[model samples]
Target chain A: CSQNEYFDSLLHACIPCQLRCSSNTPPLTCQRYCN
Target chain B: KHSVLHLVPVNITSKADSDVTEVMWQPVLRRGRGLEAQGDIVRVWDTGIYLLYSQVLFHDVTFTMGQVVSREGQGRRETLFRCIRSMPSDPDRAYNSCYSAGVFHLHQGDIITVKIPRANAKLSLSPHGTFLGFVKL
Candidate 1:
């Protein structure tokens, strides 16, 4: 509920729309290797 | 751009002289048959990462998968996969299937081949059961 808050499509939550996993973009697919 | 090549070994009999047996490959997809390949080799046109997969049936045999660079003077051969299994004395055990897969970054004009040092046993080449293909990423 703040200026920097954003929605995460994968997490289905409203949180900081930022990079994750060692700053790597999260993959769209759910496979283990894709991540 | 993404394109995939679907292929299967046509004649996979044992060769008499060479340690490596060159199995003929046929394209299952129309595009694959159009240009990039000939009888037993695939000449890569799209340079990218590719995923290879194959399911083979063996009757008491050992086989290995490899690739060769056609124009390379001498040292352009690489073995990618290998597996060994024997058919049991019982008929039920004879249908032992061998499956293999791998990922490789390749350029154009590369040759993919299947080789077996020992071909005392038989290798199934029925496309309906045994299959091989590569998908571009």
Candidate 2:
């Protein structure tokens, strides 16, 4: 599940996690989900 | 939706059309939730082995998600591995998502262990990355 909630569940307005693989993911380039 | 993303490769085994590429050892995991302490590893190879381009997915340590893609050149088409797992699960939920590696398996689990590599005893992501010990069922 997204928002780290439950399985197959996405969070509302969670904005997803601030992802950064190694300081080079290109901000705003990530569209959905983490990993 | 997320079609291209799904097409991403988590690990790739690159070996020319007719060659033998092997994992260095057998992958070992106790098989359970507690195993989460070890973290997850995703790798790409020139021939399905661990010596190629590989990546590791750590818990509370690395980025949110990571992906690897193996490219099949003019000789033939290729397949890759896709790993998506974290730590935690309960009440009909997984720590991350119901993640998996390799071609969704079509639900048949077509791969199995045949030969176990006897060298390279490192627990990293590589054909010989300690976990390199299985076969295609």
Candidate 3:
């Protein structure tokens, strides 16, 4: 995974962190932002 | 004599189960010699004073997040500089950038690298947002 991406255990692959929710949602809750 | 090396973000693999997150870098430009990049480590070939700078854009809402710049050589390891920034818990406003710089005397064969102490740290890879550089003086 790149610095801008995170490894997903479930998917077993690197996922980009650019995805954003339409509303103000915590990254943990959205599961789209890497943390 | 003058030497300079500027490094930008590279692929960084953080294990889902690991507690350490190390930043990786690659040289975007090298000029006038004396500095080299070996993965995330920078090696100094000329012994002299140097202006060192580093910046990282953190995307996590970890309350606070930061990075450490360290030097390894002469049978010892020491931190050169580090910066921390408070982050807003709100995911939309959780983004923060930490930048730190200093002037230090370096020796031939000195090695340098930036480290993020927190686990699973999320950072931006924007070339201008996250970078490390050294200018020999």
Candidate 4:
């Protein structure tokens, strides 16, 4: 998984973190998942 | 006299919604007394200084991954030790193992567990690749 991607256990593959936490505002869950 | 206990990883279901995931463990060896394991938690029955160690084998291409050993007791929780390792960008070479160990004065009734601070972490459960143990001193 890259900085922008994360491993999805359900899919058993690497996927873009943004797909899960889609937003450009504060409280970005994607940031937590990617980092 | 001293006591010893060793544990290996077990296949367990974990949710991907949380950044902190506890690793499930099964006892591989137990002797004397003072230490017991239940699921992901290890309990101490004897108070003394002991060497605690853990190793985790990661199989993901994450840029970085690590594990933290935490102890909870006496109404307080703290991390005893932790280790981090960088993963290769190439998927084929992304395998890495992070290990950490420390000596601490553990008290009776203390509960300890290892946690991975990543959502959906890919790890190897092979005994040799992932393990935890304690040796009383």
Judging by DockQ against the true structure, name the best candidate.
Answer: 4
Question: Model 1: which residue pairs collide?
Answer: none
List the RMSD of every prediction in angstroms.
Answer: 17.9, 16.1, 9.5, 7.1
lDDT of 3 by residue, B63-125 (tens): 557888889999999988878787787777888889999999999999987877555678888
Give the TM-score of each candidate: 0.60, 0.24, 0.75, 0.79
Give DockQ per model, in order.
0.01, 0.07, 0.04, 0.08
On residues B1-137, what C-alpha lDDT tens digit does candidate 1 reach at each position? 45777777788655543333445778886343212656666676656677877666655412122222222213587656654444454344556776778887776666666554332335567886566677776
lDDT of 2 at B70: 37
**TM-score (C-alpha) between model 2 and the true structure:** 0.24
Q: Which residue window of length 10 is worst by lDDT in model 1 chain B?
A: B61-70
Per residue, candidate 4 scores C-alpha lDDT tens digits across B4-107 of: 99999886445644665567889888779898998888999999999999999988666667788889999999889888887776667889999999999999
Best by lDDT, which number? 4
Q: For model 4, what fraction of the real interface contacts is kept?
A: 0.00
What does the lDDT read for residue A16 in candidate 2? 29
lDDT accuracy of residue A7 in candidate 4: 63
